[PDB]
Amino acid sequence: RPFMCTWSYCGKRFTRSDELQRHKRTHTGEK
Ligand SMILES: [Zn+2]
């Protein structure tokens, strides 16, 4: 699965691109 978050500290792979969008959406700060 070519879906991995860029957050190194995160250390978690994904199966859907949408996940990273929303998950990363709150990886830091708040936005
Ligand atoms: Zn992540």
Swiss-Prot record:
Protein family: Belongs to the Sp1 C2H2-type zinc-finger protein family.
Expression by tissue: Up-regulated in adenocarcinomas of the stomach (at protein level). Isoform 3 is ubiquitously expressed at low levels.
Further information: In the hepatoma cell line Hep-G2, SP1 precursor mRNA may undergo homotype trans-splicing leading to the duplication of exons 2 and 3.
Positions of C2H2-type zinc fingers: 3-27
Residue numbers of Phosphothreonine PTMs: 15, 28
Role, per record: Transcription factor that can activate or repress transcription in response to physiological and pathological stimuli. Binds with high affinity to GC-rich motifs and regulates the expression of a large number of genes involved in a variety of processes such as cell growth, apoptosis, differentiation and immune responses. Highly regulated by post-translational modifications (phosphorylations, sumoylation, proteolytic cleavage, glycosylation and acetylation). Also binds the PDGFR-alpha G-box promoter. May have a role in modulating the cellular response to DNA damage.
Residues of the full protein shown: 654 to 684 of 785
UniProt source species: Homo sapiens (Human)
Post-translational modification: Phosphorylated on multiple serine and threonine residues. Phosphorylation is coupled to ubiquitination, sumoylation and proteolytic processing. Also implicated in the repression of RECK by ERBB2. Acetylated. Acetylation/deacetylation events affect transcriptional activity. Deacetylation leads to an increase in the expression of the 12(s)-lipooxygenase gene through recruitment of p300 to the promoter. Deacetylated by HDAC6 which leads to increased expression of ENG and positive regulation of angiogenesis.
Expression induction: By insulin.
Domain of life: Eukaryota
Domain remark text: The 9aaTAD motif is a transactivation domain present in a large number of yeast and animal transcription factors.
Summary of subunit composition and partner proteins: Interacts with ATF7IP, ATF7IP2, BAHD1, POGZ, HCFC1, AATF and PHC2. Interacts with HLTF; the interaction may be required for basal transcriptional activity of HLTF. Interacts (deacetylated form) with EP300; the interaction enhances gene expression. Interacts with HDAC1 and JUN. Interacts with ELF1; the interaction is inhibited by glycosylation of SP1. Interaction with NFYA; the interaction is inhibited by glycosylation of SP1. Interacts with ATF7IP and TBP. Interacts with MEIS2 isoform 4 and PBX1 isoform PBX1a. Interacts with EGR1. Interacts with SMARCA4/BRG1.
Protein known as: Transcription factor Sp1
Intracellular or extracellular location(s): Nucleus; Cytoplasm
Impact after mutating residue 15 to A: Abolishes PRKCzeta-mediated but not PKCdelta-mediated phosphorylation. No effect on DNA binding
Modified residues (Phosphoserine): 17
